[PDB]
Amino acid sequence: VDHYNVAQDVVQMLTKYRELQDIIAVLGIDELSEEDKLIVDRARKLVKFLSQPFQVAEVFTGMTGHYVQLDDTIDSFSGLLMGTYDQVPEMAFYMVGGINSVLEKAKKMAEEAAELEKMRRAR
């Protein structure tokens, strides 16, 4: 039942995202409501989060692949829909496998940007 509910919610959110994409093409991305400016964000992370690196492509693309278990998939998407991961950057979900990969990539991004600030603050 949880799997079915999560899948339907994702589909509904994606459908709403397409409808909102029509309106951001009319009034720019502010003029919708607060709710439809949180739907867009969590539904611009779902789209980025649906991409997965395949182990078969390790040689060509270099990046190591991921095999996401079904249990992880349901929880990972379920948490995103509720809004638990509303502070993670959008790009952390692009070509990553599982929720843990999202978090580790966030560490590598937050720490990476830390050096950039110390550089840009200095020099």
Partner 1 sequence: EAAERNPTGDNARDRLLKEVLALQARINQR
Partner 2 sequence: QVQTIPMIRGARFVALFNQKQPSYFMNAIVSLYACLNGYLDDVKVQYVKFYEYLLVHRDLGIMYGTAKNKFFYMYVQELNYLIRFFTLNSPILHGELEEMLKQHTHLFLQHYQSKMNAIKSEKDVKALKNLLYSCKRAV
Binding residues for partner 2, rule: CB under 8 A, are: 1, 4-5, 9, 82-83
| Count of residues in the chain | 123
Is 90 a binding residue for partner 1 by CB under 8 A? The answer is no
Q: Which is nearer to partner 2, 7 or 63 (CB)?
A: 7
CA dihedral 67, 95, 93, 33 (to 10 degrees): -120
User: Which listed option, partner 2, partner 1, none, makes contact with residue 5 (CB within 5 to 8 Å by class)?
Assistant: partner 2
Torsional sign, CA 95, 46, 87, 78: negative
Q: Which is nearer to partner 2, 58 or 86 (CB)?
A: 86
